[PDB]
Amino acid sequence: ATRDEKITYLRKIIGDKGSDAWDVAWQEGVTPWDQGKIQPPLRDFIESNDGKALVNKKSDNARVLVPGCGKGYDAAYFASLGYETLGADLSSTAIEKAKEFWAESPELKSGKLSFQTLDFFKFEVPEAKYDLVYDYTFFCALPPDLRAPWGARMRELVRPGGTLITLVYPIDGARSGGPPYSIDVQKVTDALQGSEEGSAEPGKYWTKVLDIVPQTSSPDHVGRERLVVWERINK
Ligand SMILES: Nc1ncnc2c1ncn2[C@@H]1O[C@H](CSCC[C@H](N)C(=O)O)[C@@H](O)[C@H]1O
Ligand SMILES: Cc1cc(C)c(S(=O)(=O)O)c(C)c1
Ligand SMILES: [Cl-]
Ligand SMILES: [Cl-]
Ligand SMILES: [Cl-]
Numbered sequence: 490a491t492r493d494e495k496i497t498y499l500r501k502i503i504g505d506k507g508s509d510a511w512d513v514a515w516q517e518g519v520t521p522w523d524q525g526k527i528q529p530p531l532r533d534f535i536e537s538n539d540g541k542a543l544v545n546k547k548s549d550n551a552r553v554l555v556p557g558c559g560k561g562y563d564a565a566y567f568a569s570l571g572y573e574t575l576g577a578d579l580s581s582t583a584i585e586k587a588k589e590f591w592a593e594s595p596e597l598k599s600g601k602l603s604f605q606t607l608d609f610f611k612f613e614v615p616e617a618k619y620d621l622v623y624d625y626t627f628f629c630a631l632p633p634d635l636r637a638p639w640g641a642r643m644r645e646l647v648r649p650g651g652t653l654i655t656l657v658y659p660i661d662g663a664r665s666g667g668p669p670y671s672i673d674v675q676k677v678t679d680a681l682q683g684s685e686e687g688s689a690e691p692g693k694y695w696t697k698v699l700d701i702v703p704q705t706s707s708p709d710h711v712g713r714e715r716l717v718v719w720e721r722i723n724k
Contacts, residue, residue: 511579522669552621624656629667629669641683655716656714660713694722697717703715
């Protein structure tokens with residue numbers, strides 16, 4: 490009934506079942522992460538001068554991926570901006586619940602928004618790749634040993650010149666255990682920029698164009714959140 494009890498249980502079943510535990514949690518209603526809406530820093534970025542420029546330059550066929558989308562609030566948001574958007578989640582339960590929650594969306598109706606039960610690590614990347622990817626409470630959901638393949642998938646998923654937005658949360662310092670794991674921008678950087686081969690200064694695969702403290706974090710997010718925008722390079 491308590492958040493902590495619910496997190497304790499989520500971590501217990503992740504220990505027994507691995508990644509299969511996520512659909513179990515959704516089936517059983519153990520969804521402590523669920524907020525019922527997007528995080529404000531996403532809307533405020535999109536509505537900022539950098540955000541307007543990003544949306545205004547989008548191609549007519551521009552595609553968005555929202556991985557680990559849960560009930561899909563962020564995917565619905567991007568679809569409402571005119572992006573052909575895919576919300577992907579491992580859990581078939583989560584994906585049905587996303588289709589329920591957004592049942593009235595005009596973009597779900599048109600097919601411009603789509604929710605699909607997909608494993609972020611396994612699904613077939615479209616040939617044209619994604620123009621824009623948004624990661625929130627997905628990187629911090631993964632066990633630490635999966636951060637490196639997450640970065641590698643991100644490098645394959647975002648087209649050259651495309652953009653990845655990571656809302657980095659929770660930044661709780663040295664706290665161990667997860668989900669949610671305590672993350673920071675450095676951890677995201679190391680995953681995204683990958684192997685340095687011969688100890689090469691990171692900057693090989695992405696440019697970190699913007700890294701801010703959002704001025705409109707949710708109250709329990711204040712002091713534990715950064716918004717980072719990454720551009721895919723090595724064209
Ligand atoms: N390999 C994987 N591929 C796609 N989704 C995954 C995944 N592993 C875990 N997930 C999903 O990641 C989510 C973590 S919590 C849901 C967070 C969501 N971004 C939100 O803000 O509401 C769960 O829904 C889980 O089903
Ligand atoms: C992946 C994940 C899981 C949980 C339990 C939480 S939360 O309970 O702290 O809100 C968050 C933010 C992300
Ligand atoms: Cl919303
Ligand atoms: Cl898949
Ligand atoms: Cl692939």
